[PDB]
């Protein structure tokens, strides 16, 4: 039948690139703010076709007025934080989960760590070091929150990318 999956999180976190890398195996080189995009793909689940509807929402505060119009009939959420932005990780707890809990309290959600390949990149670690997240920290927040589970991935290298949507898809169909 049909699974609805909405992707929310702070701006610049990598929600669009996640979705475009999954659906088409391409990276968008530039950074354009999302207002709203809806995609769909077919996914085979034990030989039976499902439409995975993917609702790419604005992280930017400019388009708050619009975002929750995506939320009715949602089967699963991906609450995204970049693992190289502590501010976006704290906004999972402080903002995003409160939003989706209020509009969609019975709807399961997964915490998605994005941009995990920049955990090695020294360029960005310097600006984390001078200003002064790991799986074990996010997994606690997932168990507390209470997300279905924690998953993480990189849209560039596709590490654990398929697994994000695999667990999202299972989460939706169980509940």
């Amino acid at each position: 039948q049909t699974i609805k999956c909405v992707v929310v999180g702070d701006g610049a976190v990598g929600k669009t690139c996640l979705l475009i890398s999954y659906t088409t195996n391409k990276f968008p080189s530039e950074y354009v703010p999302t207002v709203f995009d809806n995609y769909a793909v077919t996914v085979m689940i034990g030989g039976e076709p499902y439409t995975l509807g993917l609702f790419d929402t604005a992280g930017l505060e400019d388009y708050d007025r619009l975002r929750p119009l995506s939320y009715p009939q949602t089967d699963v959420f991906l609450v995204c934080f970049s693992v190289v932005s502590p501010s976006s990780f704290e906004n999972v707890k402080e903002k995003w989960v409160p939003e989706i809990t209020h509009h969609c309290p019975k709807t399961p959600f997964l915490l998605v760590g994005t941009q995990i390949d920049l955990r090695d990149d020294p360029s960005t670690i310097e600006k984390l070091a001078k200003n002064k997240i790991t799986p074990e920290t996010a997994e606690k927040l997932a168990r507390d929150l209470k997300a279905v589970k924690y998953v993480e991935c990189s849209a560039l290298t596709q590490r654990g990318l398929k697994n994000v949507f695999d667990e999202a898809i299972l989460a939706a169909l169980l509940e």
Binding site: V35, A40, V41, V43, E48, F165
Partner: protein, 40 residues
């Protein structure tokens, strides 16, 4: 029936159904879902 597994395949059939944008000039949305247009 009893031999149905939970293999989740790779995606196929990409479909970009909606692209909403924002007019710089008129402070307006372009490419809304027509359902939402009444609301705001």
């Amino acid at each position: 029936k009893r031999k149905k597994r939970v293999e989740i395949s790779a995606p196929s059939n990409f479909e970009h159904r909606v692209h909403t944008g924002f007019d710089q000039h008129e402070q307006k949305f372009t490419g809304l879902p027509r359902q939402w247009q009444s609301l705001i």
